[PDB]
Design a protein around this ligand. Structure first.
Ligand code: HEM
Ligand SMILES: O=C(O)c1ccc(-c2cccnc2)cc1
Ligand SMILES: [Cl-]
Length: 393
């Protein structure tokens, strides 16, 4: 009934060009079995959406990586939000929602936009830059650690820690095992910055600790929720902004449309999230026997959701492989769907919008002018190096 495939979706060959293998996974059937790792897979939009939206059957508290927390010890104490199910999930989620709220966005927007305009002006003075290190990484580094309230010393640990977190959702391949081998100094730094005295007043970290007296979370929960933001909030935006710039570099017609109407910036970023799907994959674990797209999956089974494949499924999308900045993107699953849908999506969209607005207003052309190098990670899709010449408007 269920087709068995030997595709390794965590192999470097797959990361280097996932699209043929993703079509193979979709067209093999609504549910496949991946013999390489002994997990079920779903790569069509319909089944990915269905799994995301049934958290009771497809739970998160046994881990959203390959490892089953019921069988192995997690590599660090479990997340109180990403790796929790309702009802334990509900109040931590409510707190991060209020911390990363519309009102917080209103407080930080003008500074985030100024930093974006400043970065693009700086990059235009150089002309030839690396859109990864010099833009996708430098811009989030210039705003997010400060918005968290982190001290200056030690910020060089943040991207390495994120790379570790995202590799650790994967199977025990060399990417994962190498990351864990090198983890100890990054864990030590991060865990220390999560304590209330180390988080500057008014930042996201202090706000989490401020919410510990409402009955939603206790003081001893606040450090691990700060940990959630220090795990998630930087490398995601690096690869979302990188995705958008790479799209604009490859599709000059869409850069030209964005220049002519800079208010398309927010949707241009959203389409880049659909088109590249920088967060590629998450797992769930079945809590019972279940029928999904005609197949029967037993209890205690890992299910791998291919978010990026779902976002290119022609059963759901017209011209899925076209970057279209005026596409109706609502319903894409690049930020998830349902009770765990990205609680940081307003930060992500703010950063992406203000960066693409700065490009739309200041840049006439983005031309790749050097070798493109991909960055390999078990969960994140994105580039290591993207050499571009920026032409000023
Ligand atoms: C382009 C950028 C981003 C993308 C594509 C993205 C993608 C996602 C996805 C797919 C999920 C669902 C996980 C699941 O269902 O198991 C998620 C959840 C989450 N994201 Fe993001 N994310 C981004 C940015 C951010 C940022 C900037 C932050 C923090 C400031 C953040 C914090 C979180 C948290 C805390 C969760 C867990 C929510 C929950 O379990 O209820 N994310 N994200
Ligand atoms: O440590 C955590 O709780 C945590 C770690 C990573 C994420 C995450 C992953 C992908 C996109 N957005 C957020 C979320 C939460
Ligand atoms: Cl840690």
């Amino acid at each position: 009934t269920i087709p068995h495939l030997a595709i390794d979706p965590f192999s470097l060959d797959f990361f280097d060009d996932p699209y043929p293998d993703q079509q193979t996974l979709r067209d093999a059937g609504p549910v496949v079995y991946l013999d390489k790792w002994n997990v079920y897979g779903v790569a069509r939009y319909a089944e990915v959406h269905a799994v995301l939206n049934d958290p009771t059957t497809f739970c998160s508290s046994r881990g959203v990586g390959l490892s089953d927390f019921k069988k192995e010890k997690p590599w660090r104490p479990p997340s109180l939000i990403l790796e929790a199910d309702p009802p334990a999930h509900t109040r931590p989620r409510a707190v991060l929602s209020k911390v990363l709220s519309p009102a917080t966005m209103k407080t930080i927007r003008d500074g985030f936009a100024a930093a974006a305009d400043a970065k693009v002006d700086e990059l235009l003075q150089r002309g030839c830059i690396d859109a990864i290190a010099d833009l996708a990484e430098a811009y989030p580094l210039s705003v997010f650690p400060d918005a968290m309230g982190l001290k200056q010393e030690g910020r060089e640990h943040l991207l390495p820690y994120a790379g570790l977190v995202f590799n650790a959702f994967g199977p025990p391949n060399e990417l994962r095992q190498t990351a864990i081998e090198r983890s100890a100094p990054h864990q030590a730094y991060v865990n220390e910055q999560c304590q209330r005295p180390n988080l500057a007043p008014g930042g996201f970290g202090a706000c989490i600790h401020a919410f510990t007296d409402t009955g939603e979370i206790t003081p001893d929960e606040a450090p691990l929720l700060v940990r959630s933001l220090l795990s998630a909030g930087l490398d995601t935006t690096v690869n979302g902004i990188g995705a958008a710039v790479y799209c604009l570099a490859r599709f000059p017609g869409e850069l030209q449309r964005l220049r002519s109407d800079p208010t398309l910036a927010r949707n241009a970023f959203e389409e880049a999230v659909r088109f590249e799907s920088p967060v590629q994959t998450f797992f769930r674990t079945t809590t019972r026997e279940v029928e999904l797209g005609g197949a029967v999956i037993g209890e205690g089974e890992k299910v791998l959701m291919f978010l990026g494949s779902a976002n290119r499924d022609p059963r759901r999308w017209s011209d899925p492989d076209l970057y279209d900045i005026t596409r109706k993107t609502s319903g894409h699953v690049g930020f998830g769907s349902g009770v765990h849908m990205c609680v940081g999506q307003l930060v992500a969209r703010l950063e992406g919008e203000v960066m693409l607005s700065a490009l739309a207003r200041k840049v006439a052309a983005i031309d790749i002018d050097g070798p493109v190098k991909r960055r390999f990670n078990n969960t994140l899709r994105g580039l290591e190096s993207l050499p571009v010449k920026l032409t000023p408007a």
